[PDB]
Amino acid sequence: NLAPLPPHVPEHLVFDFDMYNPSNLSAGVQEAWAVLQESNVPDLVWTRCNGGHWIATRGQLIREAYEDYRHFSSECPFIPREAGEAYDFIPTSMDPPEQRQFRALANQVVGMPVVDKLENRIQELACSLIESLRPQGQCNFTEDYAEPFPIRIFMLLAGLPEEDIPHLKYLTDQMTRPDGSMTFAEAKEALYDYLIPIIEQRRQKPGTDAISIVANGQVNGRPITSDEAKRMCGLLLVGGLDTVVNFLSFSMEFLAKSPEHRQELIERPERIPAACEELLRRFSLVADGRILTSDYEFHGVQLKKGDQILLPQMLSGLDERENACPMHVDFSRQKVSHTTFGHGSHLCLGQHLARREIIVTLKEWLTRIPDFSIAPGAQIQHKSGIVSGVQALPLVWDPATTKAV
Ligand code: HEM
Ligand SMILES: CC1(C)[C@@H]2CC[C@@]1(C)C(=O)C2
Ligand SMILES: [K+]
């Protein structure tokens, strides 16, 4: 339903966008969010949905607000308010200065040096999964690849059993795209219920997995607390299980629908890194935000202490003011402007792992299955939330057009 309009919000700024079920969803989720960038829509609107909150609709404002942590705090970064209040992951629920010390520790477990120790295993799993599908001439891409590839890599990194994936993936999804059965607070507590014993165990008997490294880590030279380690590990799980997983499906849906972009990357494989970046712009998928720390006039709009503002990372790169013909995918685009991995002091720490997983997927899939399509008569349905995704992606191909490496 629609929350009562706060006294300070004028009627002319009301645009009742629902980030968990946007009205234009059938057009594609990016398309659905892009309604906020039609010419008649102001740069900053109020929606009465999901408890009531601001939405910045343009890259300029989104970037400004992410830079200004003084006014726009990460203490309550999710909508609805109950979710943002319960949200206590580290480093994301902290502002500078206290946030910064935790980034280095997170870098030890998901940063570039670790991508290096994983490189071969990433490559091997992608190739194995794709070769298994190749002779079938069909797959359900979400369940058959988009989930198991990044998730099994994360579970390896974290030293967690693969049989725990269904439970962990369910919990993670309630924090980003709740089905209604659990509040954010309940999902978070369930995730902590999982992690607590494991963190204890690995502080007693450290291994070399990511949970052990975090749980025994130092932050600016002093020991991390069990509490802090839990709040960091919860965030790593969510990043591992619900980011790349969704992004791969948007990318593969696009490639299934655009043979000439497939051919471009097959003919000119050196373009794959650039293609990855353009796809990250076009199929950007995250939208969280901030809470006002004080009353503040921003771009001529009165904001009040405690107001939440959604700052959709998704939207900056889709803004025509940042990229011309923004819904068009051009792998040769010269300045690919986006905030897909965030902006300001909270820039994604998992982005190198993410790019590796994306690039390996594009190369190893097109190597083996260059020619594929959406299944006959399928209409691909998206889903929206803090991280958006694809409900199902049935693909088909003729095995005769494939190549076993
Ligand atoms: C396509 C893949 C991904 C996208 C689009 C993405 C997006 C983002 C965004 C937008 C933020 C900033 C949120 C904010 O400012 O409130 C962020 C932060 C973060 N991400 Fe990523 N992410 C991805 C993959 C990953 C992965 C795979 C991991 C770990 C396995 C990860 C770990 C983190 C962490 C730890 C932060 C917190 C940084 C901080 O708060 O200081 N992300 N990500
Ligand atoms: C917004 C995010 C993508 C970023 C990493 C996981 C996520 C859901 C967060 O809670 C912070
Ligand atoms: K909070």
**Phi/psi-derived region of residue 155, left when phi > 0, alpha when psi is between -120 and 50, beta in every other case:** alpha
3-class secondary structure per residue, 330-397? CCCCCCCCCCCCCCHHHCCCCHHHHHHHHHHHHHHHHHHCCCCEECCCCCCCEECCCECEECCCEEEC
Provide the annotated binding site for heme: 348
What token pair was written down for 350?
């998992």
Write the single-letter amino acid at 300. Answer: G
Cβ–Cβ contacts within 10 Å for residue 10, how many? 10
Question: In angstroms, rounded to a whole number, what is the distance separating the alpha carbons of residues 54 and 301?
Answer: 10
What token pair was written down for 154?
């994360």
Question: In angstroms, rounded to a whole number, what is the distance separating the alpha carbons of residues 91 and 181?
Answer: 27
Task: Calculate how far, in angstroms, residue 172's C-alpha sits from the geometric centre of ligand 2.
Answer: 10
Q: What order do you get walking across the sheet with 373-374 strand by strand?
A: 138-140, 394-396, 373-374
Q: Using an 8 Å Cβ cutoff, are 209 and 201 in contact?
A: no
Nearest CA to ligand 2 atom 5: 239
H/E segment holding residue 298: strand 296-298
Structure obtained using:
X-ray
Resolution in angstroms, to 1 decimal, for this deposition? Answer: 1.6
Write the single-letter amino acid at 26. Answer: S
Atom index in ligand 2 nearest the CA of residue 176 equals 8
Cβ–Cβ contacts within 10 Å for residue 298, how many? 19
Beta strand 72-73 with 138-140: parallel, antiparallel or unpaired?
unpaired
What token pair was written down for 90?
């580290």
In eight-state DSSP terms, residue 168 is: H
Angle, CA of 66, 67 and 72, to the nearest 5°? 55
* Number of domains observed in the structure of the chain: 1
* Burial tier of 400 (Cβ tally within 10 Å: 0-12, 13-18, 19+): exposed
DSSP per residue, 121-162: HHHHHHHHHHHHHGGGTEEEHIIIIITHHHHHHHHHHHT--G
Q: What order do you get walking across the sheet with 289-292 strand by strand?
A: 44-47, 53-56, 308-310, 289-292, 72-73
Atom index in ligand 1 nearest the CA of residue 288 equals 16
What token pair was written down for 343?
């902006």
Beta strand 222-223 with 218-219: parallel, antiparallel or unpaired?
antiparallel
Cβ–Cβ contacts within 10 Å for residue 60, how many? 14
Domain that holds residue 95: 1-405
CATH code for position 134: 1.10.630.10
Question: If we measure between CA atoms, which residue out of 55, 128, 67 comes closest to residue 96?
Answer: 67
Task: Calculate how far, in angstroms, residue 86's C-alpha sits from the geometric centre of ligand 3.
Answer: 5
Q: Using an 8 Å Cβ cutoff, are 185 and 82 in contact?
A: yes
Write the single-letter amino acid at 151. Answer: I
